């Protein structure tokens, strides 16, 4: 069951159609989320990074998204880690080019609008003013449809309707201002609440070296999923920049961490999760790290409970 993602893709959907047709009401076997996550985690280790989800994986992930979505509508669930692992990998699969394929799919009416991993992601920073610019350049969409594609995408990505986006995390009880949260990153034993306000009861604070869109962003870790009695008072700790770094890393450093990459004028643009060796080598060796930009910054969210900024390579 846990090693479900190591089967053939023909027998991956057939073992996930048998789960939904054989366990229709939630709660009787909540261990099916171990199978729905391991299909996602085995489709993320072999996906070309930041590319739109193609039509073969989008059918496989839509089958095993209903078994997760039957369990977010409840209140108490056994699967806490496996449920939050589906959210972080869906955040890593919802990049700036991924939403560019969904807003095409809702405009033309094709099968790209039935399912996308952005509907279950923990990206709270998506607003109307950003999604009007994330439309694809090649599909020349008229302005009457791209206003209806953003309105339809923002309706499925609602924050309060049918409790589908949040409130099941243990770290969601910490934050007081729920309107100013940008993104939540649930790593193992640490859950980073990336917000735009200091009123987040956590373990420490990290104010970024530059500004975000309007006000500067704060990264508050919640170590071992436990709030504090109050918000952290005093100065916010600085993000230590890393100037010297090696690109050809033979061992498995970085695997477990996160490598969120935001932009000052355009907002946050790409969150990635470093699950194993094949994802780490596909970050360092490709053209992802581009330091000739002016407003793009790369943050490394360690699972130790600290943040680092990548600012140089040999």
């Amino acid at each position: 069951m846990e090693e479900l993602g190591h089967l053939t893709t023909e027998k991956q959907e057939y073992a996930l159609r048998l789960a939904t047709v054989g366990y229709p009401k939630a709660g009787v076997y909540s261990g099916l989320i171990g199978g729905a996550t391991s299909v996602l985690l085995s489709a993320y280790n072999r996906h070309p990074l930041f590319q739109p989800l193609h039509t073969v994986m989008r059918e496989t992930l839509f089958i095993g998204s209903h078994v997760v979505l039957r369990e977010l509508r409840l209140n108490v669930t056994t699967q806490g880690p496996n449920l939050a692992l589906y959210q972080l990998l869906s955040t890593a699969l919802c990049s700036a080019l991924e939403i560019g394929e969904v807003l095409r799919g809702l405009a033309l009416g094709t099968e790209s609008g039935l399912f996308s991993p952005c509907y279950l992601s923990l990206r709270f920073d998506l607003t109307r003013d950003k999604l009007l610019s994330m439309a694809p350049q090649e599909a020349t969409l008229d302005q009457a449809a791209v206003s209806n594609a953003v309105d339809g995408f923002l309706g499925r990505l609602s924050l309060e309707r049918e409790d589908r986006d949040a409130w099941h995390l243990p770290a969601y009880k910490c934050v007081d201002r729920l309107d100013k949260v940008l993104m939540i990153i649930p790593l193992i034993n640490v859950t980073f609440i990336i917000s735009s306000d200091r009123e987040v009861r956590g373990s420490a604070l990290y104010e970024a070296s530059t500004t975000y869109l309007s006000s500067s962003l704060f990264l508050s870790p919640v170590i071992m999923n436990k709030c504090s009695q109050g918000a952290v008072a005093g100065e916010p700790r600085q993000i230590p920049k890393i100037q010297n770094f090696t690109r050809t890393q033979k061992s498995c450093i970085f695997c477990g961490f996160a490598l969120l990459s935001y932009d000052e004028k355009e907002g946050l643009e790409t969150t990635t999760y470093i699950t194993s060796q094949e994802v780490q080598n596909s970050i360092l060796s490709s053209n992802y790290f581009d330091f000739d930009n002016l407003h793009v910054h790369y943050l490394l969210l360690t699972t130790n409970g600290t943040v680092m900024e990548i600012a140089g390579l040999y």
Epitope: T211, L213, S214, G267, Y288, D292, N293
Partner: antibody, heavy 120, light 112 residues
């Protein structure tokens, strides 16, 4: 409307300083990256620098150390540019251009222009 | 140190013919993780402040007419005016927002 408007041009002696100003209305002068762009007499446009909303980061064109000092004041709804050590080639106009967020770091609204001249 | 080029300098039109102008960069202006192609095309009428026509090399700003269909990606970029008229005699500058911004040379449209 928006109507960015500068003031503080004229004829300046060479080898000094000047504090040009900007003035905005009709929109929120805070939460906006404002820039400065100068022309030349009948030549192509040149970029000078920019400043974020809370005055935390300031970029510049490749130049000397303190040739340009950009500093905004959100209470007066003004934006100041201070050109120091005026050479004989700084005669220009000076545009106060606002750069919005989800644009391609381009300049939406441009001001009028203030003729700076440096000579005898 | 991104330096922009433009050709030709003095492009003369007649009232109605389709014309183009190239803005060939020196370095690639392509954001690798969102595919945005940082660029902006500006028009300066003689005796006015510039105007913003295109940004991100294809997305035309609102209020600009439908005759300014500019595109191109990676290093070379073009701007294609569909049917020019006497209300378009102006310079045309291309900017880049990848590095510290650098305007282009400038092409002007002289009616014959």
């Amino acid at each position: 409307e928006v109507k960015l408007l500068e003031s503080g041009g004229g004829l300046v002696q060479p080898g000094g300083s000047l504090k040009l100003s900007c003035a905005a209305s009709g929109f929120d002068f805070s939460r906006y990256w404002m820039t400065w762009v100068r022309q030349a007499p009948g030549q192509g446009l040149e970029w000078i620098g920019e400043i974020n909303p809370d005055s935390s980061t300031i970029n510049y064109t490749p130049s000397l150390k303190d040739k340009f000092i950009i500093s905004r004041d959100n209470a007066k709804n003004t934006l100041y540019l201070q050109v120091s050590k005026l050479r004989s080639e700084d005669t220009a106009l000076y545009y106060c251009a606002r750069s919005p967020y989800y644009y391609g770091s381009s300049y939406d609204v441009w001001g009028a222009g203030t003729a700076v001249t440096v000579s005898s | 140190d991104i330096v922009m080029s433009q050709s030709p300098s003095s492009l003369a039109v007649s009232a109605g013919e389709k014309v183009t102008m190239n803005c060939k960069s020196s370095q690639s202006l392509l954001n690798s993780r969102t595919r945005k192609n940082y660029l902006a095309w500006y028009q300066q009428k003689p005796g006015q402040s510039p105007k913003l026509l295109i940004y991100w090399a294809s997305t035309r700003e609102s209020g600009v007419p439908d005759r300014f269909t500019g595109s191109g990606s990676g290093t070379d970029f073009t701007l294609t005016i569909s049917s020019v008229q006497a209300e378009d005699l102006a310079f045309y500058y291309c900017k880049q927002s990848y590095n510290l911004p650098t305007f282009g040379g400038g092409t002007k449209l002289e009616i014959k």
